[PDB]
Amino acid sequence: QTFXNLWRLLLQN
Amino acid sequence: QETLVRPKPLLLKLLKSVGAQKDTYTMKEVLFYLGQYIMTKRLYDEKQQHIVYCSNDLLGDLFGVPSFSVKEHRKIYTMIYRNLVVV
Ligand SMILES: [Cl-]
Ligand SMILES: [Cl-]
Ligand SMILES: [Cl-]
Ligand SMILES: [Cl-]
Ligand SMILES: [Cl-]
Numbered sequence: 001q002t003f004x005n006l007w008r009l010l011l012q013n
Numbered sequence: 014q015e016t017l018v019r020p021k022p023l024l025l026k027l028l029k030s031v032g033a034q035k036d037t038y039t040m041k042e043v044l045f046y047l048g049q050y051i052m053t054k055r056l057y058d059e060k061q062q063h064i065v066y067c068s069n070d071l072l073g074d075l076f077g078v079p080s081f082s083v084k085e086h087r088k089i090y091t092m093i094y095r096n097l098v099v100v
Contacts (some may be wrong), residue, residue: 003062006083007048011041013086 016040017100023075024096043093057083 018038020028028038028046031053051057051065056072058064063083067073076092083089
């Protein structure tokens with residue numbers, strides 16, 4: 001996984 | 014819904030370094046700009062991109078850790094909340 005998608009999963013609780 | 018926040022000085026500096034231009038933010042805005050900051054500065058491990066290294070970055074001084082994992086949802090929020098005031 002990309003940092004971009006991992007952080008989006010974080011933001012998108 | 015939204016939660017409005019006022020970053021403390023070092024967080025405010027970080028936010029503005031990636032385009033933020035105000036004193037009061039939503040939490041969604043704070044989390045966006047932090048993600049943008051980490052990505053822009055390529056702080057994450059190139060191979061295991063959940064790992065963020067920040068011991069030689071302002072982010073380490075903000076969070077008070079040399080590194081963390083993007084999967085630590087609670088700890089990240091705790092480290093962000095220490096650097097802002099709600100409402
Ligand atoms: Cl919010
Ligand atoms: Cl500060
Ligand atoms: Cl820095
Ligand atoms: Cl956690
Ligand atoms: Cl608070």
